[PDB]
Design a protein around this ligand. Structure first.
Ligand code: HEM
Ligand code: HEM
Ligand SMILES: C[C@H](O)[C@H](O)[C@H]1CNc2nc(N)[nH]c(=O)c2N1
Ligand SMILES: C[C@H](O)[C@H](O)[C@H]1CNc2nc(N)[nH]c(=O)c2N1
Ligand SMILES: [Zn+2]
Lengths: 420, 417
């Protein structure tokens, strides 16, 4: 370091990174090993296991409050020094402190801005922040989440949003959305060993069923919300169906494609991540933007028990499926992604293709390097899962590093929860 | 750090890496920045005696360990013999067995190579007695003929004399042994392979008379003993080529495209025991997606990707039609179909990545790990429908290794006036 250059090998544009000097947490890499493809490479946290002591929390608070007041050209201002004194006394009397609305908004936007894995970040400063820190019950969380879904969906003109529930206190009163996303389809393990619905959600579906949910065992079964407030046992809630925008998937040239009876939901809303601002941990911070078409996992969706939507498309396309070298998987994959984009666009539901999104991300990187001196970026996650080398991010070198505020992963609550 | 675990999020298979404890050279990353997607993180800069000794001992220790003779009298005398050579001559010479072992493990250690399940079957051609570019040409012709094997390709490496003082390097100035020329036209269009315009200009500048055709095999530009490079024309009957056609699009053959059967990387440096083999052309066989025919500019400023989409009557107005994606798949279908039809070895990215996963698991079992560069192992298309996408990998640099080295035209001290 001192500065680190990244090069685009198509355009030969070189960007020079100084922002990485502000990085706090370990990537997991060393001089001798690179962990760039490990999902969860580092356990390096800014605060310890449980209720931090003052000398563990206040340095983190000061750093964030310093960062925030710097960001508004108010460093050392009257309001800044007062805020530090305020945070100091709050920690002294409660072992935590409470963000101001401006600080919460600033922190959530920057956690997104710092999300190295997110290709959508050109939009980062246009995040609608819903303060839900007054919420006390799962019912209130359900209400907050319904309003989020309604606002974000916006009749298909999707709007970036995050709803932030009360921060962690002692780790035994966590707010959690047990759902990984607010809207997902059930996965049903079948007695003949196979899977019905979305196979990614089989375990959570079973948890819901175990928690009393009566599964329709139908086709595209929207999973209930499993909401945990104040560390209590989670509670089941059915999202009002009129709040769940769905796009029937059809194909602009394959008339048979709609006969697959496929649909997907318009709003992707990640709800299992942890938002970390100045040592404060918001274990329930569901956020939503809009889909990049490649994200829509309708390809893995199982409508029967012995075949998959990829294979089913390839069959209806009369592709030879004996040998891989026919690229029938690649052919069908493209066609499914054409259908998804075509269907969302026809229904006027916000969606971005991976060409437009990666092109915007390159534009975002240029902006960030110009104004901020860097942009943390995880090539492994930024490059789209299809047609990687014909998108502009492929030949774009990227530096990955951990800035705070940040979105963090956290354990699945059912592994960690003590029932009552 | 005893153990490191990599998980496959598709299969849930967890592998434990101990082999990373043996790594010695940098990855480029630091504890706070990952440089995993950075491409690469003086001639006098040859190993001093004191630098060379421990690199040599590290290699010899590793070799005698591999043949279950570590600490043996043979091991000890080889060590002593190597140190005497470094003491007197400031360098030392690999035994033939050590050279073979070393080239094979440089491939085995190539974290960016998806084809490593084959590593132990490499044919090693010892060309360390070579002294001139003519001799290099002869050695390279024999490599091409042996590796091509009338389309039943065989992996091979040809190793020219190691670096001495940095002023006597052997170099293949070609990036691959067989490439097509690229010619920039006055009107900004490109004829042939736009990837090779720069090297083509060097060749013409060295006196090569270019055919200025569409698929002109470039001349070999060969440098021996630090002398100026010399041009040689590969005998055309040694260059196996595949006309590219499509199993369904009859018009694809009318694009008049072909590609060469033998990918043979010639610009890397082979490092064994601190010794540097600056000329070590090696070859296996293509993965279909490597073949750069799509970037090829037959006739004009437009390339085969665009031309194929045009013939496919694709809506090229908007990106969200995914016409680029569709034409990309069709080009890769045509490439695999053509090679297979002509019985020229090729692997598709599905087969290649599935084999890599098997290879990686076997390496974890028998070797304690497999350094792998996800950024380069995942194919350049359809990444997530291949098994490596969900495969966590640990990247680390083991020696012997293949390394990048500067382009020779940037560093060569020209002799001829
Ligand atoms: C506005 C449109 C957005 C688009 C197109 C987008 C796109 C993406 C994509 C493609 C990924 C890779 C993960 C995957 O493949 O599923 C990702 C990851 C991520 N996004 Fe965005 N995103 C958007 C909005 C947002 C917002 C509003 C936030 C938070 C305020 C956010 C935070 C994140 C985070 C933290 C990750 C990493 C998640 C993980 O590690 O699993 N994104 N995004
Ligand atoms: C036998 C079939 C082989 C296949 C299918 C194969 C495939 C590949 C692929 C797909 C890459 C990624 C870089 C790229 O996109 O070109 C790669 C990289 C590499 N391969 Fe292999 N390879 C094979 C044989 C070999 C052999 C015989 C050697 C050396 C003895 C070798 C050494 C390397 C090295 C050093 C790299 C890294 C190149 C770089 O960093 O730019 N490979 N290989
Ligand atoms: C093992 C691998 O690193 C991991 O599965 C990552 C790879 N890159 C990814 N990239 C995106 N966008 N989404 C993903 O889930 C993943 N998975
Ligand atoms: C910027 C990026 O890291 C670089 O261009 C790499 C990415 N991965 C790659 N992977 C393969 N197989 N081949 C390549 O040329 C590249 N390019
Ligand atoms: Zn790294």
């Amino acid at each position: 370091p001192r500065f680190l250059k990244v090069k685009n090998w198509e355009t030969e544009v070189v960007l020079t990174d100084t922002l990485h000097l502000k990085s706090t947490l370990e990537t997991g890499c060393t001089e001798y090993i690179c962990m760039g493809s490990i999902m969860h490479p580092s356990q390096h946290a800014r605060r310890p296991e449980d209720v931090a002591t003052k000398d563990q929390l206040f340095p983190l608070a000061k750093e964030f409050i310093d960062q925030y007041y710097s960001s508004i050209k108010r460093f050392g201002s009257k309001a800044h020094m007062e805020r530090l004194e305020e945070v100091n006394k709050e920690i002294d009397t409660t072992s935590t402190y409470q963000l101001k609305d401006t600080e919460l908004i600033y922190g959530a936007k920057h956690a997104w801005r710092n999300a190295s894995r997110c290709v959508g970040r050109i939009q980062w400063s246009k995040l609608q922040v819903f303060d839900a820190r007054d919420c006390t019950t799962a019912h209130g969380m359900f209400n907050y989440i319904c309003n989020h879904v309604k606002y974000a969906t916006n009749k298909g003109n999707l709007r970036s949003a995050i709803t932030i529930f009360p921060q962690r206190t002692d780790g035994k009163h966590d707010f959690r959305v047990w759902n990984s996303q607010l809207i997902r389809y059930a996965g049903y393990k079948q007695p003949d060993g196979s899977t019905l619905g979305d196979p990614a959600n089989v375990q959570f579906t079973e948890i819901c069923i175990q928690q009393g949910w009566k599964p329709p065992r139908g086709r595209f079964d929207v999973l209930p919300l499993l909401l945990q407030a104040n560390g209590n046992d989670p509670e089941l809630f059915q999202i009002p169906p009129e709040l769940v925008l769905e796009v029937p998937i059809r194909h602009p040239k394959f008339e048979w494609f709609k006969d697959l009876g496929l649909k997907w939901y318009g709003l992707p809303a990640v709800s299992n991540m942890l938002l970390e601002i100045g040592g404060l941990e918001f274990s329930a911070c569901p956020f939503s933007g809009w889909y990049m078409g490649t994200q829509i996992g309708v390809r893995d969706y199982c409508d029967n028990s012995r075949y998959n939507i990829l294979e089913e498309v390839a069959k209806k396309m009369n592709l030879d499926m004996r040998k891989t070298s026919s690229l029938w998987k690649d052919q069908a994959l493209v066609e499914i992604n054409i259908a998804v984009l075509y269907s969302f666009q026809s229904d006027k539901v916000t969606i971005v293709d991976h060409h437009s999104a990666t092109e915007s991300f390159i534009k975002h990187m240029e902006n960030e390097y110009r104004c901020r001196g860097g942009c943390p970026a995880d090539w492994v996650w930024i490059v789209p899962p299809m047609s990687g080398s014909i998108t502009p991010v492929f030949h774009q070198e990227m530096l990955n590093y951990r800035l705070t505020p940040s979105f963090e992963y956290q354990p699945d609550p059912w592994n960690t929860h003590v029932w009552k």
